[PDB]
Design a protein around this nucleic acid. Structure first.
Ligand SMILES: [Mg+2]
Lengths: 1316, 50, 50, 50, 251, 66
RNA sequence: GGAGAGGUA
């Protein structure tokens, strides 16, 4: 069941739910989006193909030629990722498109091809996404963050009684096309219906009704239910449907069928409707007051005179009834209105409508759009038909049409991108229905309303925006004359494309600098879902509702992982199993549940479909048949958790950990923590510094292998085989005999990135975790990245903690750390800096970088080499000279004042055409020697790999063992062997070698063409030299180190070993935390991890006992087998009887420091299992031991909690925070001290800190803090000469920023002066 | 919500109870941030009048 | 368990139309608040003199 | 070429710039006369920098 | 000012002034050349718009943008708002003789004292150290004293212990909400890098030790030292000004 | 209210460093106003002793002088 | 000197 390379150390998986869908590739959104961008799409709807098909063919306006598009191809990048980062240039591929310019001849009729030319034109270099999701843009790895924006479609909304002071809600409906003018309907405070476009002048909705060839009769037919009146011999026989009377008040003698049904003064009851239908009553006799205010539907003309009696939509009257009666009218049609359920929101608009026919409505629209420009008849009709009903100038996208049809309860999710008449009709009908009382408005926080714009879509949109300018230029050049001498390169320019692509990738609001101080930090920064950026809301104009988690977030967006401060819930992070739909919406997987069986088919439900079905809870106890154990199981129907039946459920959650993100699913015992403290725990787990020696967590979740593998930090084997050669800088894998390809047999070589710097100035390196000659398999890790142990994420150390107050040294949130923690160097972290010294081309010529500097002794120049550059490996401190440089008339690059370090790498760049010094050549020949060495080692090891396989096929068919080395390995071809498929392999395998003999001759020359070539530089700089310093910050009071459950705190004292509280066995506690942080800050999960960490180290202290004294492996195999048992029906179920008797002593060697424990996010180890695990080891089962004082030597009362909490070390080091300044540089425009730590600047005594000096009586302290200390230039030099002269006294005067304010106010037409 | 969280922090909150807890806690955190941004302007107004 | 039984009783009352929706909702809120008070009182009585 | 499928004869000029002469317009396609059918030059199509 | 790359900063006021001068000179040329009334009227309108964009840009209908569609900063924008003169350079300034560091507890302190790093205290009290070095005659100039304190000889530490003796320093936490947010303290030199803060003034500061930072200002004069010791010392602020109840309550 | 009770101040500097500098100076320039530094905020602006604390005795001495 | 992004209290 297990591989060979997981048996090194298998984590004891707790947890009870079997997994039916494994955790997907965590970087799926980035790679899938940029794969939909750069791929040939035969259907032509994704990425570059969609853009080229949307723009091309470009037809000229003259009418003779067009430029059509054939295909495209991304060329090989000039460099690859490593030297793209080294030189500081983009890792991009050159786009090469095959354009096909036709030429139509003038003499022939319309459409005839004189000539047609074609060439592959280069247009723009587009950046390439790396193997992970990162873009190397200018030598700095950035990440484009997926956006969460408003989807195109139709949106019914309302402003909840917050306008016009009427206390009334005004419902509106927007139609938002992907490309076109928006169409807004809204309700007036008088219940009128009003239409506007682009928020122009507000028009009645009947204007756009009449614009679609609708008379008043058809409008009232559409928007109203008819009531028939039948004038007869006796008194207004009106047909009356019984359920039309609900919610109405009787006002007359309601009598029918010879029965007095309802008397006046009554509300019409339900049983009245029941009896009126039970007696089957349809026609009623009513008085004439019931027609005194009704509205006629259609027009009624006299059948003889032919004159208009009553117009359409007129209020009937007594004499009007007489006039229709005298004209032989029998059926009279009125509109069914109401005060509650059917308002007259259309009739009132028609009475506000200042038009009467189609043409007046179109002219009113025309005058609304463009004031002035006197209307004509085509100028209005063509404008309206091209406004909403033209494919060229209006387009709902596929997602737009999908949302449009889905919100209107249609079924066809596809159709025309333009608006239809029935579409606008349905929008008005739905809006009037919302106003009526049925239905609800749409909330924009819903994830079925917000849409993901990942890397590929935004880049493609920016590419198309840049391509519009190009097609304008091409159409211009085509429309100019004399086309027969042209080619598709003179008209098309790559500068708009490259500009609009490089501007988006380089400097945008969503293409942002990568956080790179963890594998976790990278892999979770590539999965943010930002609600900001272009086309999105503002950071500081966002309300309380979009910032809050919505019931739709379940399974798509994590609810606990989000930053705190200025933007909570605007930088939301993806969940674990969350995917992006075909249309860009977020969707989450669910097991399809049949009649009673929880099956194993997985359907990915989107955010809109999830409200229709009912979904069970993640942890509902099913047992061996998919049958639920209960009959009242907790489920979610539509944003409402509640208990439903057993045979009602339609879906079940895939796993308990699909609600949380990837960083918040690394927290053990998450279900015991609070939500605030879990938020802090995730946000601080993203910031841990990778320490010197990575150390696994004893208590984990098992989501750490997935994080350390899916992130690209670890070097992972591609094809299984045998490790032929392990070095500190490379791993060589001899591939197996089946996975190896027939042509280009070869072997695998992995180069390990050594001590290079990351973005956050941490050190990232890869270290081999495989021995020599170990069988590795496909997908298995070979080299640990930064802060991973055996290919699983290990952000910090796991350390023996005690929860007790210790003499106030852990008072509020502080931490008391043993000195053995510093002695073991287990929090010492490498920090690599980069210092650049440039050579500007200035007046009096450029500057030399030689060592000859005035006013420096040999004590300063003792470290520089002969050419003025610091020696590699020279331990420099603050204030030394790294690269000497002189002023043309002391411009030497100094170490920053406070940092130390060992210079580990010097990189020198030179312009194309500058003579280089000996140090640049000293690097150059050493760089070039490796290039010869690496390719020869690439070849001769592969040469050893070919001839070994050439010898391998010599096991049969031509076997002469002695003859193979009568002549050397070169000629194993013309030897005696039967000319068959076996001899075909010899001429095939050596053909690769002959190809490699041609690979050697051009590749090494190409690497010569790059090493000595002049690198591209900025205009003005002539040569750049870069120095790298590796610094080991160990630990000290002031450093901020935190745990995994949101319990931060600065280390306060480094207290020696003898002062630590030891137990009854002599082992000193490493860290003494405070108990008072547990009740208030409700992170109980830090205590169970402490108990489970102590239990985990209990197993590692009994395996150490059985290994320190040598015991037979039958004892070790017995105990380790018991330790992987004792779960309450857990799913792990390992078997030590299948281990080959040397994979146990290799397993028990990795378990001698504590057996690792997997605690899944909501399938945690129950408290009864923690005690039982504490009982297998001989530890006490209460989790608390008797702990002795370290100094007085006597026993602490009240036995205290000890255990092994896994403590991180955050990237807020007190070395980088401590600042001080007495006097320094000053700002130019205002004579005040500068601001910052890089600039040697002073603190800001801000406005809010001045009030606290006026609130005292400190009037002399306040005066010196804003005249003498800060601003007044003529009295602060007098102060410095007074402080040194032993005279503490100020002569302040007037601040220099007041005189700036006078000169600025006087720079207007405002005279401000000072009086007597 | 008519179904309360019937599990303390010593026992384990299941998924739905934790989601509801997150509703409450995210409400509290956003309210805290914007109430800080409001009270700062309030005390600035009070200082500048007296 | 008593609270679950009696809220099942209120649910059966609603399914037979003896109570409205808002009244059932308010009754469920009231009974769950009472159960919370009883659990809190039992927990304090177990702690403060254990 | 815009909804009209046609047959062309395709020539490779310098830098692999294709040119499709219509088969109806065959009379501008003359054979080589320099007598160097395997040593003929290859004109750059379109005359860029001509 | 230059951008250190050979290129100069935008300096948005010079752009507005240059546009005003350009339109004014063009209008003078049009007046000299006896231009037709419509052309000179258009140019006079453009000069009016240029001057209005120089005085208060954006108050009229459309502002003018210099780079990346961001509107230019005018003369009235150097006074308004948080980044104007009044609220940024006059009511609160940047202050010399000041430092900043992370706080730890150090519960061995008394109520009237705070820890202070040796390096931070040496940099903050540098002119006082110069004065004492010239007083004891170890350096008969300021340059020798500067090189002596940058070398950190074994004698400048006794000079620190002399200048520290009764010289209170003001400690201020970043969101100073009431007058207990700035308090005087007496410095005790610490061979560390973190400002140890007496755990009874955390109630006043609202300063937990979960990563907070604190600013140290050195009162310079003699009036300022006596003001610190008399009014702002932490042994005088044991009652809250909001109500007579104590503010140094055991936490 | 406190927004209007501080902009309707007899001094045009204690109301200019508060909100709406533009609306205050134009109203206080056409009126030819004259601040006389009778406050705490406009002595912070101009850099002199606050007339409240230990600088209160200074401002009485400076007032009886003139 | 200014914008954009992220972070700590
Ligand atoms: Mg804090």
């Amino acid at each position: 069941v297990y591989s060979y390379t997981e048996k090194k150390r298998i984590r004891k998986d707790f947890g009870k739910r079997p997994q039916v869908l494994d955790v997907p590739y965590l970087l799926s959104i980035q790679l899938d989006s940029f794969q939909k961008f750069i791929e040939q799409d035969p259907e032509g709807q994704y990425g570059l193909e969609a853009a080229f098909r949307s723009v091309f063919p470009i037809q000229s306006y003259s009418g003779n030629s067009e430029l059509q598009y054939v295909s495209y191809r991304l060329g090989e990048p000039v460099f690859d990722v490593q030297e793209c980062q080294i030189r500081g240039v983009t890792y991009s591929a050159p786009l090469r498109v095959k354009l096909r310019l036709v030429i139509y001849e003038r003499e022939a009729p319309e459409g005839t091809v004189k000539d047609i030319k074609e060439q592959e034109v280069y247009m723009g270099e587009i950046p390439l996404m790396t193997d992970n999701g990162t873009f190397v843009i200018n030598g700095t790895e950035r990440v484009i963050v997926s956006q969460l924006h408003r989807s195109p479609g139709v949106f019914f909304d309302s402003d909840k009684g917050k306008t016009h002071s009427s206390g009334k809600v005004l419902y509106n409906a927007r139609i938002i096309p992907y490309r076109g003018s928006w169409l807004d309907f809204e309700f007036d405070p008088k219940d009128n219906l009003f239409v506007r476009i682009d928020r122009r002048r507000k028009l009645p909705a009947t204007i756009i009704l009449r614009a679609l060839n609708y008379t008043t009769e058809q409008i009232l037919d559409l928007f109203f239910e008819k009531v028939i009146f039948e004038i007869r011999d006796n008194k207004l026989q009106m047909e009356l449907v019984p359920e039309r009377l609900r919610g109405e008040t009787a006002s007359f003698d309601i009598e029918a069928n010879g029965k007095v049904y309802v008397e006046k003064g009554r509300r019409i009851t339900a049983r009245h409707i029941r009896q009126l239908e039970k007696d089957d009553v349809k026609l009623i006799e009513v008085p004439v007051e019931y027609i005194a205010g009704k509205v006629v539907a259609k027009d009624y003309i006299d059948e003889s005179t032919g004159e208009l009696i009553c117009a359409a939509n007129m209020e009937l009257s007594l004499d009007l009834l007489a006039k229709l009666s005298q004209s032989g009218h029998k059926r009279i049609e009125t509109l069914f209105t109401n005060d509650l359920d059917h308002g007259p929101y259309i009739s009132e608009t028609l009475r506000v409508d200042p038009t009467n026919d189609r043409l007046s409505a179109l002219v009113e629209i025309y005058r609304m759009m463009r004031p002035g420009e006197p209307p004509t008849r085509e100028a209005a009709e063509s404008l309206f038909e091209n406004l909403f009903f033209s494919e060229d100038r209006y387009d709902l996208s596929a997602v737009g049409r999908m949302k449009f049809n889905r919100s209107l309860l249609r079924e066809e999710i596809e159709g025309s991108g333009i608006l239809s008449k029935d579409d606008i009709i349905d929008v008005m009908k739905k809006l009037i229905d919302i106003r009526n009382g049925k239905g609800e408005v749409d909330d924009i926080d819903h994830l079925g309303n917000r849409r993901i714009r990942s890397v590929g879509e935004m880049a493609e949109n920016q590419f198309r925006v840049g391509l519009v300018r190009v097609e304008r230029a091409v159409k211009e050049r085509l429309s100019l004359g004399d086309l027969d001498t042209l080619m598709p390169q003179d008209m098309i320019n790559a500068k708009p494309i490259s500009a609009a692509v490089k501007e988006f990738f380089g400097s945008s609001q969503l293409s942002q600098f990568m956080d790179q101080n963890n594998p976790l930090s990278e892999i979770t920064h590539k999965r943010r879902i930002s609600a900001l950026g272009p086309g999105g809301l503002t950071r500081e104009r966002a309300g309380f509702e979009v910032r809050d988690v919505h019931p739709t977030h379940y399974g798509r967006v994590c609810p606990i992982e989000t930053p705190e401060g200025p933007n909570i819930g605007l930088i939301n992070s993806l969940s674990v199993y969350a995917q992006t739909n075909e249309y860009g919406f977020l969707e989450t997987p669910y097991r399809k549940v049949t009649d009673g069986v929880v099956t194993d088919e997985i359907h990915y439900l989107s955010a809109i479909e999830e409200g229709n079905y009912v979904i069970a809870q993640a942890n509902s106890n099913l047992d061996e048949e998919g049958h639920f154990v209960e009959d009242l199981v907790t489920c979610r129907s539509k944003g409402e958790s509640s208990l439903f039946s057993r045979d009602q459920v339609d879906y079940m959650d895939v796993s308990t950990q699909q609600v949380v993100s990837v960083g918040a699913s690394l927290i053990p015992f998450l279900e015991h923590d609070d939500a605030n403290r879990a938020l802090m725990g995730a946000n601080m787990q993203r910031q841990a510094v990778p320490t010197l020696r990575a150390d696994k967590p004893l208590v984990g979740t098992g989501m750490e292998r997935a994080v350390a593998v899916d992130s690209g930090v670890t070097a992972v084997a591609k094809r299984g085989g045998v490790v032929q050669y392990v070095d500190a800088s490379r791993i060589v894998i001899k591939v197996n005999e089946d996975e190896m390809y027939p042509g280009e047999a070869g072997i695998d070589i992995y180069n390990l990135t050594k001590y290079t710097r990351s973005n956050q100035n941490t050190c990232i390196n890869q270290m081999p975790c495989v021995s020599l000659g170990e069988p590795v398999e496909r997908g298995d890790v070979l080299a640990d990245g930064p802060s991973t142990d055996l290919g699983e994420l290990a952000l910090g150390q796991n350390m023996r903690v005690a929860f007790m107050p210790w003499n106030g040294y852990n008072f509020e949130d502080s931490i008391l750390v043993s000195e053995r923690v510093v002695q073991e160097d287990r929090f010492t972290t490498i920090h690599i800096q980069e210092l650049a010294c440039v050579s500007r081309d200035t007046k009096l010529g450029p500057e030399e970088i030689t060592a000859d500097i005035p006013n420096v002794g040999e004590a300063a120049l003792s470290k520089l080499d002969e050419s003025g550059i610091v020696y590699i490996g020279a331990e420099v401190t603050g204030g030394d000279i790294l690269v000497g440089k002189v002023t043309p008339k002391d411009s030497s690059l100094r170490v920053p004042n406070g940092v130390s370090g060992t210079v580990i790498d010097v990189q020198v760049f030179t312009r194309d055409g500058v003579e280089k010094d000996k140090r640049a050549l000293e690097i150059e020949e050493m760089q070039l020697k490796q290039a010869k060495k690496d390719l020869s080692e690439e070849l001769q090891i592969l040469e050893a790999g070919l001839f070994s396989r050439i010898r391998a096929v010599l096991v049969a068919g031509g076997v002469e063992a002695e003859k193979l080395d009568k002549l050397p390995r070169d000629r194993w071809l013309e030897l005696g062997l039967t000319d068959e498929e076996k001899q075909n392999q010899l001429e095939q395998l050596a053909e690769q070698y002959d190809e490699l003999k041609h690979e050697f001759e051009k590749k090494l020359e190409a690497k010569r063409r790059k090493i000595t070539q002049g690198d591209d530089l900025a205009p003005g700089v002539l040569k750049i030299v870069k120095v790298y310093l590796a610094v080991k910050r160990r630990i000290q009071p002031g450093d901020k180190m935190a745990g995994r459950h949101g319990n931060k705190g600065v280390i306060s004292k480094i207290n020696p070993i003898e002062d630590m509280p030891y137990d009854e066995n002599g082992t000193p506690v490493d860290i003494v935390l405070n108990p008072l942080g547990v009740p208030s800050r409700m992170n109980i999960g830090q205590i169970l991890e402490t108990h489970l960490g102590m239990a985990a180290k209990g197993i590692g202290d009994k395996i150490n006992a059985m290994l320190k004294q040598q015991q037979e492996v039958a004892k070790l195999r017995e105990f380790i087998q018991r330790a992987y048992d004792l779960g309450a029906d857990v799913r792990q179920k390992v078997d030590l009887s299948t281990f080959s008797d040397e994979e146990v002593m290799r397993l028990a060697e990795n378990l001698r420091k504590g057996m690792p424990i997997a605690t899944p996010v909501f399938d945690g180890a129950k408290e009864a299992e923690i005690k039982e695990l504490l009982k297998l080891g001989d530890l006490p089962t209460s989790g608390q031991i008797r702990l002795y004082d370290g100094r007085t030597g006597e026993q602490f009362e009240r036995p205290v909690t000890v255990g092994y909490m896994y403590m991180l070390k955050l990237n807020h080091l007190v070395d980088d925070k401590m600042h001080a300044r007495s006097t320094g540089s000053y700002s130019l425009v205002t004579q005040q001290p500068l601001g910052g730590k890089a600039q040697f600047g002073g603190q800001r005594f801000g406005e809010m800190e001045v009030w606290a000096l006026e609130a005292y009586g400190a009037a002399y302290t306040l005066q010196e803090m804003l005249t003498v200390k800060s601003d007044d230039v003529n009295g602060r030099t007098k102060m410095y000469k007074n402080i040194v002269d032993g005279n503490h006294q100020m002569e302040p005067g007037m601040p220099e920023s007041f005189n700036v304010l006078l000169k600025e106010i006087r720079s207007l037409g405002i005279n401000i002066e000072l009086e007597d | 919500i008519e179904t309360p969280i019937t599990a303390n922090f010593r026992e384990g909150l299941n998924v739905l109870q934790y989601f509801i807890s997150t509703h409450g806690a995210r409400k509290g955190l956003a309210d805290t941030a914007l109430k800080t941004a409001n009270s700062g302007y309030l005390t600035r107004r009070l200082v500048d009048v007296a | 368990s008593e609270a679950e039984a009696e809220v099942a009783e209120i649910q059966e009352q609603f399914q037979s139309g003896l109570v409205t929706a808002g009244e059932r909702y308010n009754k469920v809120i009231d009974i769950w608040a009472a159960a919370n008070d009883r659990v809190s009182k039992a927990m304090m009585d177990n702690l403060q003199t254990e | 070429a815009g909804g009209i499928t046609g047959e062309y004869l395709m020539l490779t000029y310098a830098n692999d710039a294709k040119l499709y002469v219509p088969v109806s317009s065959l009379h501008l396609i003359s054979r080589y006369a320099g007598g160097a059918e395997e040593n003929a030059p290859l004109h750059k199509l379109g005359g860029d920098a001509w | 000012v230059p951008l250190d790359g050979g290129r100069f900063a935008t300096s948005d006021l010079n752009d507005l002034y240059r546009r005003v001068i350009n339109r004014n000179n063009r209008l003078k040329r049009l007046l000299d050349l006896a231009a037709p009334d419509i052309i000179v009227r258009n140019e006079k309108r453009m000069l009016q718009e240029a001057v209005d964009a120089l005085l208060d840009n954006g108050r009229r209908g459309r502002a003018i943008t210099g780079s990346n569609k961001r509107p230019l900063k005018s003369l009235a924008d150097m006074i308004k708002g948080k980044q104007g003169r009044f609220r940024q350079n006059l009511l609160g300034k940047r202050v010399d003789y000041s430092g900043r560091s992370v706080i730890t507890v150090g519960p061995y302190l008394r109520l009237h004292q705070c820890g202070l790093p040796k390096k931070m205290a040496l940099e903050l009290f540098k002119p006082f150290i110069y004065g004492k070095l010239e007083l004891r005659g170890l350096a008969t100039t300021i340059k020798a004293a500067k090189k002596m304190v940058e070398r950190e000889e074994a004698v400048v530490w006794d000079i620190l212990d002399e200048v520290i003796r009764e010289h209170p320093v003001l400690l201020n936490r970043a969101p100073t909400l009431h007058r207990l947010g700035i308090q005087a303290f007496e410095p005790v030199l610490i061979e560390g890098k973190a400002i140890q803060l007496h755990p009874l003034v955390c109630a006043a500061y609202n300063a937990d030790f979960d990563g907070d930072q604190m600013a140290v200002h050195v009162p310079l004069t003699l009036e300022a030292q006596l003001e610190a010791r008399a009014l702002m010392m932490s042994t005088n602020n044991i009652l809250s000004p909001a109500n007579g109840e104590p503010i140094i309550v055991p936490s | 209210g406190i927004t209007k009770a501080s902009l309707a101040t007899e001094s045009f500097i204690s109301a200019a460093s508060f909100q709406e500098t533009t609306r205050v100076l134009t109203e206080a320039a056409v009126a030819g106003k004259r601040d006389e530094l009778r406050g705490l905020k406009e002595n912070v602006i101009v850099g002199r002793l606050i007339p409240a604390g230990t600088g209160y005795a200074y401002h009485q001495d400076r007032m009886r002088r003139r």
